[PDB]
Every structure is written in structure tokens, then in C-alpha cells.
Design an enzyme around this catalytic site. Structure first.
Site, mmCIF file in Angstrom:
data_model
loop_
_atom_site.group_PDB
_atom_site.id
_atom_site.type_symbol
_atom_site.label_atom_id
_atom_site.label_comp_id
_atom_site.label_asym_id
_atom_site.label_seq_id
_atom_site.Cartn_x
_atom_site.Cartn_y
_atom_site.Cartn_z
ATOM 1 N N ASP A 16 -19.615 -32.181 -5.483
ATOM 2 C CA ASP A 16 -19.463 -31.868 -6.920
ATOM 3 C C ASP A 16 -18.593 -32.988 -7.505
ATOM 4 O O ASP A 16 -17.525 -33.228 -7.004
ATOM 5 C CB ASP A 16 -18.806 -30.509 -7.145
ATOM 6 C CG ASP A 16 -19.548 -29.371 -6.447
ATOM 7 O OD1 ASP A 16 -20.775 -29.401 -6.353
ATOM 8 O OD2 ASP A 16 -18.866 -28.449 -5.955
ATOM 9 N N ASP A 135 -25.719 -18.352 -11.876
ATOM 10 C CA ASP A 135 -24.304 -18.283 -11.536
ATOM 11 C C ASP A 135 -23.694 -17.154 -12.295
ATOM 12 O O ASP A 135 -23.766 -17.113 -13.507
ATOM 13 C CB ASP A 135 -23.653 -19.619 -11.856
ATOM 14 C CG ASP A 135 -24.255 -20.751 -11.058
ATOM 15 O OD1 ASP A 135 -24.817 -20.525 -9.948
ATOM 16 O OD2 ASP A 135 -24.179 -21.895 -11.537
HETATM 17 N N1 LIG Z 1 -17.647 -24.885 -13.121
HETATM 18 C C1 LIG Z 1 -18.296 -25.230 -12.008
HETATM 19 O O1 LIG Z 1 -17.821 -25.377 -10.892
HETATM 20 C C2 LIG Z 1 -19.737 -25.354 -12.252
HETATM 21 N N2 LIG Z 1 -20.316 -25.229 -13.479
HETATM 22 C C3 LIG Z 1 -21.607 -25.472 -13.338
HETATM 23 N N3 LIG Z 1 -21.855 -25.718 -12.029
HETATM 24 C C4 LIG Z 1 -23.189 -26.097 -11.507
HETATM 25 O O2 LIG Z 1 -23.723 -27.026 -12.486
HETATM 26 C C5 LIG Z 1 -25.147 -26.891 -12.463
HETATM 27 C C6 LIG Z 1 -25.737 -26.417 -13.779
HETATM 28 O O3 LIG Z 1 -25.533 -27.389 -14.816
HETATM 29 P P1 LIG Z 1 -26.258 -27.142 -16.201
HETATM 30 O O4 LIG Z 1 -25.706 -25.796 -16.737
HETATM 31 O O5 LIG Z 1 -25.775 -28.306 -17.024
HETATM 32 O O6 LIG Z 1 -27.723 -27.036 -15.890
HETATM 33 C C7 LIG Z 1 -25.475 -25.842 -11.408
HETATM 34 O O7 LIG Z 1 -25.663 -26.415 -10.096
HETATM 35 C C8 LIG Z 1 -24.207 -25.005 -11.401
HETATM 36 O O8 LIG Z 1 -23.958 -24.283 -10.201
HETATM 37 C C9 LIG Z 1 -20.722 -25.680 -11.376
HETATM 38 N N4 LIG Z 1 -20.628 -25.887 -10.012
#
Ligand SMILES: NC(=O)c1ncn([C@@H]2O[C@H](COP(=O)(O)O)[C@@H](O)[C@H]2O)c1N
Length: 246
Positions: A16, A135
Site C-alpha cells: 500500500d 470494504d
Molecule cells: N484507507 C485505506 O487503508 C484504504 N482506503 C482504500 N483502500 C483500498 O483502495 C482501493 C479502492 O480505491 P478506490 O476507492 O479509489 O477505487 C481498494 O483496494 C481499497 O481496499 C484502502 N486500503
């Protein structure tokens, strides 16, 4: 445990990226970042250890605090292994850019909440190069780096099933980065609701936790994303791969 011809649980070590670093958060909360250096070195470490997959997230892009597009492109290109790419993929141009990196599949999060007709179109055009990231806190979906409110998990699964979505990646936000153990109940409940493959994320703390998720493979759990337990050396990836093999 009786022999079977079912596939073993896939492991997807997470990288990440925020502010150019590989980071781990607690409940994904901005400001709780622990940094573990360069994303490229992290990714190559997991590949050397025998990873089959990398789960690569541009967290700045998810939060809307700029992006790390060049780095996540470079990491993706350096991988011989399969790459699941996400963060900021919310419209035709950001999807086209993500696909052009040569990733194996992308995950869509916010767009499944804010732009469901667009996600339906993308699913129809791109098949299994698309998964939806669901999520949750409880059963309430969250977007925009988990700062925005979406709806009910099961309502979304029912709609996405009908739209032909291939695969779901499900995070329990309350477990993520906590080393508290995975929410197995959530996984069993999601597998009862859909026949599509489910990838677990959040809370793994031990080899026993991976063994527990692996028991759910015959229910429909395909894989497990693992972050903090690997970075904090609860176990090695070599050990994790052996644990779920056998
Ligand atoms: N706050 C976080 O840790 C977090 N926020 C979003 N995500 C990940 O970002 C991605 C989604 O991004 P978007 O919402 O821009 O499609 C997914 O893989 C989701 O699990 C995270 N790991």
C-alpha cells in the site's frame, strides 16, 4: 484434513503506497501510517519469497491526496508475478491507465458506490480483469479511502452478482492493520450470499489465522490479502505459503 482436488488458498501480500512509501495503517485511518521503505523493495521481497500475487494499492489515489502513479507503474512492470492493482480507478481514463500497466486485474472501490452504472459497463467489457473491492465497517460499505458512506454490503453483492461481477475483495475495516485476527463470520456470510470467488483482507495475525481462512476455501474464499503480519514479521511468506499448502 482429508485430501482434496480443490485449489489451495492464494496469498496476496499487500504493498500500500502513500507519499512514495510502502505503509501499513490501523483501520485505514489517515495519520496512522507506519512506513516500511520503498514499494519496489517491498514488492521484490515478496516475489523472492515465492509470492504468486501482489496486491498493490495507491492509497494517495484512494484518499484523493495526489497519487503515486509512476511508482505503482514501475512496481507493476518489475513483477513477474500476478498483480492486483487498485486506488483511484473511478472513470474510463483512470481505468485505461491502470490496465496499461499490465496488471493482472484491478479492484474498484468508490466507483461501485458512486458510479454503479459505469461499473456495470466496465464489468461487461473487461470480465475477470475486474474485481470489486467491498470494504465495510460492519455491513456498511465505505469509499474514498474509507472516508465516505456507501450502502449495505448485501444489497451491493446482489446487484453486482446480477451485473456479472467476477470476483469480490472484502475488507473488514475494523480488523485492518490491527493484528486482531480475521473476521471469519463476515467471510462465511459473504460466501453464503454469492457464488463468485471472494478474497479476504484484514486482520491476519498468525499462521493459524491463515489456516482458518484456508478452511473456507470450499465455501468460496479464493485468497487472502496479508499486510501488517508480514511487515511486522509475525511469520515469513515462505512459512505462510507452507501453512496453506499443507
Ligand atoms: N484507507 C485505506 O487503508 C484504504 N482506503 C482504500 N483502500 C483500498 O483502495 C482501493 C479502492 O480505491 P478506490 O476507492 O479509489 O477505487 C481498494 O483496494 C481499497 O481496499 C484502502 N486500503
Amino acid at each position: 484434513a482429508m485430501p482434496s482436488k480443490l485449489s489451495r488458498l492464494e496469498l496476496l501480500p499487500a504493498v500500500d503506497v502513500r507519499d512514495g512509501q510502502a505503509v501499513r495503517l490501523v483501520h485505514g485511518e489517515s495519520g496512522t501510517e507506519t512506513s516500511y521503505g520503498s514499494p519496489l523493495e517491498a514488492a521484490l521481497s515478496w516475489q523472492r519469497a515465492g509470492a504468486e500475487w501482489l496486491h498493490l494499492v495507491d492509497l494517495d489515489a484512494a484518499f484523493g491526496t495526489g497519487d503515486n502513479r509512476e511508482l505503482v507503474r514501475q512496481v507493476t512492470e518489475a513483477m513477474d508475478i500476478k498483480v492486483e492493482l487498485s486506488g483511484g480507478i473511478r472513470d474510463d481514463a483512470s481505468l485505461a491507465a491502470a490496465l496499461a500497466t499490465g496488471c493482472t486485474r484491478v479492484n474498484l472501490g468508490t466507483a461501485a458506490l458512486e458510479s454503479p452504472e459505469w461499473v456495470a459497463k466496465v464489468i461487461a467489457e473487461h470480465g475477470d480483469r475486474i474485481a470489486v473491492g467491498l470494504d465495510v465497517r460492519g455491513t456498511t460499505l465505505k469509499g474514498r479511502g474509507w472516508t465516505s458512506e456507501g450502502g449495505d454490503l448485501y444489497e451491493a453483492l446482489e446487484r453486482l452478482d446480477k451485473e456479472g461481477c467476477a470476483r469480490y475483495v472484502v475488507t473488514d475495516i475494523a480488523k485492518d492493520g490491527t493484528l486482531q485476527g480475521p473476521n471469519l463470520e463476515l467471510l462465511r456470510n459473504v460466501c453464503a450470499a454469492t457464488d463468485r470467488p471472494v478474497v479476504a483482507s484484514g486482520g491476519v495475525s498468525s499462521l493459524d489465522d491463515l489456516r482458518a481462512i484456508a478452511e473456507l476455501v470450499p465455501l468460496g474464499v479464493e485468497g487472502s490479502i496479508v499486510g501488517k503480519a508480514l511487515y511486522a514479521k509475525a511469520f515469513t511468506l515462505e512459512e505462510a505459503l507452507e501453512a496453506v499448502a499443507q
